[PDB]
Design a protein around this nucleic acid. Structure first.
Length: 58
DNA sequence: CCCGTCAGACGCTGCGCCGCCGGCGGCCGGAGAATCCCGGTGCCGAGGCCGCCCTATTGGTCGTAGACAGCCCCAGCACCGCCTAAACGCACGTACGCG
């Protein structure tokens, strides 16, 4: 069930299980209204050599 | 004709080859998670300094440990012979041990 990303909006709600990204089984993008503390956002892709291999989580 | 002997082909048996698969082993890349420095910052406490006095040093003594000078004599050391128990060598083997 691959779902197209949708910007979840949480003006006062937390990034709860009601989060559209959460229910969509997908990470919250930086375009989402989930704050800079949302735990569903991607962490940052710090693969030193090249972000290109099996060790690269990305 | 079929049997009999030998011969030749078949079937069966045993083998290796062959391809596949697996497992293994090795080696490595590189994330990443700590540790490791490296530099900036600020104390507080060495360390440093001063006042002072109580103890360390000085002079004298005197009397006694202790040297030392001498000495006797035990007993530690040699050694000597005869003895045998005690030591030694080996002979198994099974049982602790080590994996």
């Amino acid at each position: 069930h691959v779902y197209n990303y949708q910007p979840c909006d949480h003006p006062r709600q937390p990034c709860d299980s009601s989060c559209p990204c959460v229910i969509a089984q997908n990470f919250c993008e930086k375009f989402c209204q989930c704050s800079s503390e949302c735990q569903n956002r991607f962490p940052g892709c710090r693969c030193k050599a090249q972000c290109n291999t099996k060790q690269c989580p990305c």
